[PDB]
């Protein structure tokens, strides 16, 4: 059915452009009514609409914004782009596009889950994935992933096939400036005998894809 | 423009029950008001759009009301999957604007965490600095604290805390403490302790690991 995802560089220097894409599934631009929007949130501030662009082409832009803004689709319509000009760190922020549900009323019926973009002057740094190891029914295990810039990273176990007993946490600002997370999951101690455990780690702005096993 | 504000910020609730949130605009928005559910890992979703029509796939148990001014959001079977940010956004007037949010939590009973006790790997210590992790497992409610002794020295300022947001379907929550020293302290010392106070706890727990075991 209906879905939407949101790409873009995840780190830039200030005062470059931001350019962002938004792909989507279970509709078309060329579909009367159809619409996307762009909505963004700064951290730990609220939700903020940008720019949405409908069907025929006709757009709109946060006017507080409006002269940096620039949104468009492509001519099938499966695409939205959007740029945003020489941004400074207020421009950090989660961004999101979404779906219109109606041909003129400005309400998100779909989503994305947004996409992740820093604003920073500092250089990007890949994680160490370090094992958190079963010490001894039921063990905890998992993942320390260490020492990255920017935000996200993203743990996956057995390639998705182990979501039950997971805790990924929120990922802590150490006093370096860079981050630390750990993904943890409790299993049963018999299915340490049988069952290997790993943890897959990305973190697409140093383009690091470590598959971690972690034994006991 | 229109100021959108969301009353209260924060509300805790049972399971079973019925709340009502509460969302109000600075001029008047006819009757084009949106709300959307929030939820870690999962796309946000509508709930209601023009005031009180309930979107296609929404469980009736979700109705909204309210015109002009004010309107609000009221859920009626409150399950453990509803906890979440509630937003509201005004659809009327260009520029579209959003709600502070409302967070629910979901209330259930006292529950002590399992705890969790991990070493640095050999890994790590070849880089001269040491992680160790205390993980406190499913707990309720949110308020607990972790003490890390090294010797049966009491820490201080450096260790850091991350919590879970409340888990969907048993409503409890998860904690990670890290400890961080360079390895030239970590060799020093030999008893590596997490202790543990909570409301499920009858005294502190303390959960230990000896280097080099």
């Known amino acids: 059915q209906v879905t939407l995802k949101e790409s873009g560089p995840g780190i830039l220097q200030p005062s470059q452009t931001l350019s962002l894409t938004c792909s989507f599934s279970?509709?078309?631009?060329?579909?009367?009514?159809?619409?996307v929007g762009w909505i963004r949130q700064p951290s730990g501030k609220g939700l903020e609409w940008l720019a949405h662009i409908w069907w025929d082409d006709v757009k709109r832009y946060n006017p507080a914004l409006k002269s940096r803004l620039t949104i468009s689709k492509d001519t099938s319509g499966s695409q939205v782009f959007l740029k945003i000009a020489s941004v400074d760190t207020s421009d950090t922020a989660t961004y999101y596009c979404?779906?219109?549900?109606?041909?003129?009323?400005?309400?998100?019926?779909?989503w994305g889950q947004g996409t992740l973009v820093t604003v920073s002057a500092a250089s990007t740094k890949g994680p160490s994935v370090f094992p958190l190891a079963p010490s001894s029914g039921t063990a905890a295990l998992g993942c320390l992933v260490k020492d990255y810039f920017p935000e996200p990273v993203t743990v996956s176990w057995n390639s998705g096939a182990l979501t039950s007993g997971v805790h990924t946490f929120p990922a802590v600002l150490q006093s370096s400036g860079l981050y630390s997370l750990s993904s943890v999951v409790t299993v049963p101690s018999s299915s340490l005998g049988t069952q290997t455990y790993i943890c897959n780690v990305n973190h697409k702005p140093s383009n690091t894809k470590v598959d971690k096993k972690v034994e006991p | 423009d229109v100021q959108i504000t969301q009353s209260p910020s924060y509300l805790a609730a049972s399971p079973g029950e019925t709340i009502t949130l509460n969302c109000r605009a600075s001029?008047?928005?006819?009757?084009?008001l949106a709300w959307y559910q929030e939820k870690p890992g999962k796309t946000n979703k509508l709930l209601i759009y023009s005031g009180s029509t309930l979107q296609s796939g929404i469980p009736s148990r979700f109705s909204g009301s309210g015109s002009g001014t004010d309107f609000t959001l009221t859920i009626s079977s409150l399950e453990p999957e509803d906890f979440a940010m509630y937003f509201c956004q005004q659809h009327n007037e260009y520029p579209y604007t959003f709600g502070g949010g409302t967070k629910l939590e979901i209330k259930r009973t006292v529950a002590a965490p399992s705890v969790f006790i991990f070493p640095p790997s050999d890994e790590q210590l070849k880089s001269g600095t040491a992680s160790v992790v205390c993980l406190l497992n499913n707990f309720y409610p949110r308020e607990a604290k972790v003490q890390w002794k090294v010797d049966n020295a009491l820490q201080s300022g450096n260790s850091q805390e991350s919590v879970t947001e409340q888990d969907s379907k048993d409503s409890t929550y998860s904690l990670s403490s890290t400890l961080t020293l360079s390895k030239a302290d970590y060799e020093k010392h030999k008893v590596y302790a997490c202790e543990v106070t909570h409301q499920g706890l009858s005294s502190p727990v303390t959960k230990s690991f000896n280097r080099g075991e």
């Open positions: 979404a779906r219109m549900g109606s041909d003129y009323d400005v309400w998100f019926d779909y």
């Open positions: 279970g509709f078309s631009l060329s579909t009367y009514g159809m619409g």
């Open positions: 001029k008047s928005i006819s009757k084009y």
